[PDB]
Amino acid sequence: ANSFLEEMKKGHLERECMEETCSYEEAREVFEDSDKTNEFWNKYKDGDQCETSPCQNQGKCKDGLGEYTCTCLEGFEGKNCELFTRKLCSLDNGDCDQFCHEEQNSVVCSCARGYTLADNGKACIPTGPYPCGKQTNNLTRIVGGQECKDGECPWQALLINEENEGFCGGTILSEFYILTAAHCLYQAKRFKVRVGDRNTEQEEGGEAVHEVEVVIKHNRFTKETYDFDIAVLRLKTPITFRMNVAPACLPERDWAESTLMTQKTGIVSGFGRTHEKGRQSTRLKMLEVPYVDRNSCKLSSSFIITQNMFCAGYDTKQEDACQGDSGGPHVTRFKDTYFVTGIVSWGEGCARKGKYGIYTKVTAFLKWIDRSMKTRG
Amino acid sequence: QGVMVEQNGKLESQVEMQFFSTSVNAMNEANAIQPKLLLYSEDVNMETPD
Ligand SMILES: [Ca+2]
Ligand SMILES: [Ca+2]
Ligand SMILES: [Ca+2]
Ligand SMILES: [Ca+2]
Ligand SMILES: [Ca+2]
């Protein structure tokens, strides 16, 4: 065991540790390490656990003092690696990059416009040269805003009136049709579209101007209660997708309500007012704010809040968009790609304590948006 | 036998503990690490006269 002279030499794994109690120590000087002593010792109190072969499908067997630990292959769970794990949309998006499905106790991935599925069964194909959803102490009223990096905000669409002063932000859908707020049209009977605007006064030559052809707006809109504020306008000249002009990925009606808007954060951008009673902003701006729950959304506003209204922003941090930002791009960065979420209409003031900026649900309008292309496309 | 050192004009000692503990530490359990052998350690002016 641990007698005198005995341990005045060196241990032997047959001499001592077997016919003897083999408490430890003498079980550990034979190797002098950590690699084999634990595993070896674990099998003499009650036996070895990998004798029984408990784990399934080549699941690695790890012994221990009274337990076996399994480390299986890819996609295996359970006590003995007997459970064949199911991949779901909730369980890691079904491994799909952008669009997941839960088809018959499995996941079959699809993709959005300009995207197909490769042979791997999970990852999409950015067919389009520039696929949507990728990034292609100063005073004086910078309300936490960020200047967009070159190509960082390429879906930025702008609506310009007669007098050369663009007002409403927007998300660039495609070459022909441009989404906007329904009441952004109330500003004038005539206005045009200029895309790629980043600085109106200093020109780099990288802006594209497309005339507005036909008005496709909302029918049941309310000019007081701000119910159903959304519209669609057509471009006369197609947008050749390039670094400053890239589309934004359109999610699906169900999918953006199950995963996309259930994420914590989003991005707010536009060309409206920086603050209440403030001035216009020329440099292309963007903002970073998270999404908050509905149970605090009703108590915020003084209108009637219905299922088409959600709250996004901070009660404390004072960085909120203002009038003129209606229709602006309100996107969320998904696993690897942007997908639009909100469309601005109004706000009970701008940057008020306990209040939120109002955005209309894009997925509650995506079936509306997709209807817009197959009627007069 | 601890050497002395003058601080503030007064002689003071320098001996300082050195707690210690099992090496089986290396096998299971945790903060269960308790102490088991305090050695006191100091300094002398050793001579070997003859
Ligand atoms: Ca030994
Ligand atoms: Ca033997
Ligand atoms: Ca022996
Ligand atoms: Ca013996
Ligand atoms: Ca020994």
Chain B neighbors of A37, CB-CB under 8 A: 27
Helix (H) or strand (E) holding A84: strand A83-84
Instruction: From residue A138, give the alpha-carbon distance in Å to each of A142, A143, A146, A279.
Output: 7, 10, 12, 16
Which residue has 């520039």 as its token pair?
A: A130
Nearest to A245 by CA among A172, A194, A142: A172
CB–CB of A319/A365 below 8 Å? Answer: no
Nearest to A312 by CA among A270, A350, A268: A268
Chain A neighbors of B24, CB-CB under 8 A: 24-25
Name the closest ligand to CA A5.
3
Nearest to A340 by CA among A325, A317, A309, A361: A361
Which residue has 């000249």 as its token pair?
A: A237
Question: Residues whose CB is under 5 A from ligand 5 (ion)?
Answer: A 11, 26, 29
What resolution in angstrom units was achieved for this structure? Answer: 4.0
Chain A neighbors of B25, CB-CB under 8 A: none
Which residue has 């980043």 as its token pair?
A: A198
CA distance B13 to A322: 72
Nearest to A96 by CA among A341, A366, A335, A332: A335
Cβ distance of B27 and A37 shorter than 8 Å? yes
CA distance A247 to A157: 10
Which residues of A participate in catalysis according to the annotation? 183, 229, 326
Nearest to A259 by CA among A147, A91, A141: A91
